[PDB]
Design an enzyme around this catalytic site. Structure first.
Site, PDB file in Angstrom:
ATOM      1  N   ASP A   6      18.064  26.612  -9.429  1.00 54.38           N
ATOM      2  CA  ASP A   6      16.907  25.998  -8.738  1.00 54.38           C
ATOM      3  C   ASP A   6      17.314  25.002  -7.554  1.00 54.38           C
ATOM      4  OD1 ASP A   6      14.264  24.895  -8.153  1.00 54.38           O
ATOM      5  OD2 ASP A   6      14.370  23.706 -10.002  1.00 54.38           O
TER       6      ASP A   6
ATOM      7  N   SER B  17      10.075  25.500  10.315  1.00 50.79           N
ATOM      8  CA  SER B  17       9.788  26.645  10.719  1.00 50.79           C
ATOM      9  C   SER B  17       9.251  26.508  11.985  1.00 50.79           C
ATOM     10  CB  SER B  17       9.199  27.659   9.653  1.00 50.79           C
ATOM     11  OG  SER B  17       9.158  28.987  10.172  1.00 50.79           O
TER      12      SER B  17
END
Ligand SMILES: CC(C)(C)S(=O)(=O)N[C@@H](Cc1ccccc1)C(=O)N[C@@H](Cc1c[nH]c[nH+]1)C(=O)N[C@@H](CC1CCCCC1)C(O)(O)C(F)(F)C(=O)NCCN1CCOCC1
Length: 330
Positions: A35, A199
């Site tokens: 994780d 992004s």
């Protein structure tokens, strides 16, 4: 040193991936959920209240010769889905794909929430975010990756998640056979403790790339892809049968659809998720309606590049002193 480990979808949905880790001497092998959105190694253990353990494999510290009680240390954690566990803290030898660390903190659950009990396949969590997110007090902590860094050939680990198949976690090196083209690196911000990046925009299907900054975390421990309301609405507006379900809680479409691809930018580069990655599965077994793999992040507060994105790419976690993030196509 380096390590390498097969990671395995826990069900046919790719809901999560588990990886064998050996804890203690003689090793006990537990199936841990890697994780990168949290920084605690916690396990099911002999200390867990018994009505709360349910098929899982347990860590018994008393049976390990190299375990040491971490005196006074306790931890508590809760995740974004509201699940939770707490307990106390050992150090012990931990081994991942032949990569061994000593006096690594193993966090021993005394209690776990319902979702964890009901989840027979995951015996615990290995957190691979930055060590500032670790919940052990009075002194935190420090993850497997951090502890390993001194002996690693490269302060690096890669995520190679497979679609409906096995994949690979690697530490300490980068496997050039594992992707196509070149890695593009992007800047990380550790301000919130996450693998946090930005992004450079997105395209849906064969249509135009749109240059817009999408701040977001890369998170192996989250299943879906969560994007801003207007980006996600723009995708599903291409799928003729797609509507937002209140009851199910997000965009659903006919299972018979062919979904468009989704491209996200990394710097000048592009990473295309295949429409098939984003068909998540039928909302019930035998339904005509499926649950979409891209959802709104508006209720969450941040964008999460989770498993649906990541398993489309060879992803490089470069934990040099200034961290960066790497994407190749594969
Ligand atoms: C089935 C599903 C409808 C697709 S679901 O959303 O429930 N999937 C779960 C993962 C899972 C896998 C297998 C079986 C069961 C559940 C999921 O996506 N969990 C998210 C919840 C979420 C976020 N957004 C929307 N929902 C989560 O908490 N993920 C954390 C790791 C998970 C936790 C559950 C067990 C598997 C590992 C996470 O760490 O990646 C995190 F980033 F999301 C998160 O919550 N990190 C918590 C950060 N802590 C906060 C406290 O200070 C320290 C730092």
């Amino acid at each position: 040193s380096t390590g390498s480990a097969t990671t395995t979808p826990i069900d046919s949905l790719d809901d999560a991936y588990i990886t064998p880790v050996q804890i203690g001497t003689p090793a006990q092998t537990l199936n841990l959920d890697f994780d990168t959105g949290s920084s605690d190694l916690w396990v099911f253990s002999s200390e867990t209240t018994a009505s709360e353990v349910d098929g899982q494999t347990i860590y018994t510290p008393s049976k390990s010769t190299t375990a040491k009680l971490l005196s006074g240390a306790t931890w508590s954690i809760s995740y974004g889905d509201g699940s939770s566990s707490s307990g106390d803290v050992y150090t012990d030898t931990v081994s991942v794909g032949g990569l061994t660390v000593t006096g690594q903190a193993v966090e021993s659950a005394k209690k776990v929430s319902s979702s964890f009990t009901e989840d027979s396949t995951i015996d615990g969590l290995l957190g691979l975010a930055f060590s500032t997110l670790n919940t052990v007090s009075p002194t935190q902590x420090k993850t497997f990756f951090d502890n390993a860094k001194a002996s690693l050939d490269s302060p690096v680990f890669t995520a190679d998640l497979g679609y409906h198949a096995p994949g690979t976690y690697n530490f300490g090196f980068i496997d050039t056979t594992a992707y196509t083209g070149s890695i593009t690196y992007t800047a990380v911000s550790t301000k919130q403790g996450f693998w946090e990046w930005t992004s450079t925009g997105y395209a849906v299907g064969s249509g135009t790339f749109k240059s817009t900054s999408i701040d977001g975390i890369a998170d192996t421990g989250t299943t879906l892809l969560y994007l801003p309301a207007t980006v996600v609405s723009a995708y599903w507006a291409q799928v003729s049968g797609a509507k937002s379900s209140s009851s199910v809680g997000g965009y659903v479409f006919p299972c018979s659809a062919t979904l468009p691809s989704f491209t996200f930018g990394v710097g000048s580069a592009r990473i295309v998720i295949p429409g098939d990655y984003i068909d998540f599965g039928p909302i019930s077994t035998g339904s005509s309606s499926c649950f979409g793999g891209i959802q709104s992040s508006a209720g969450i507060g941040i964008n999460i590049f989770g498993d649906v994105a990541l398993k489309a790419a060879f992803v490089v976690f470069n934990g040099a002193t200034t961290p960066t993030l790497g994407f190749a196509s594969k």
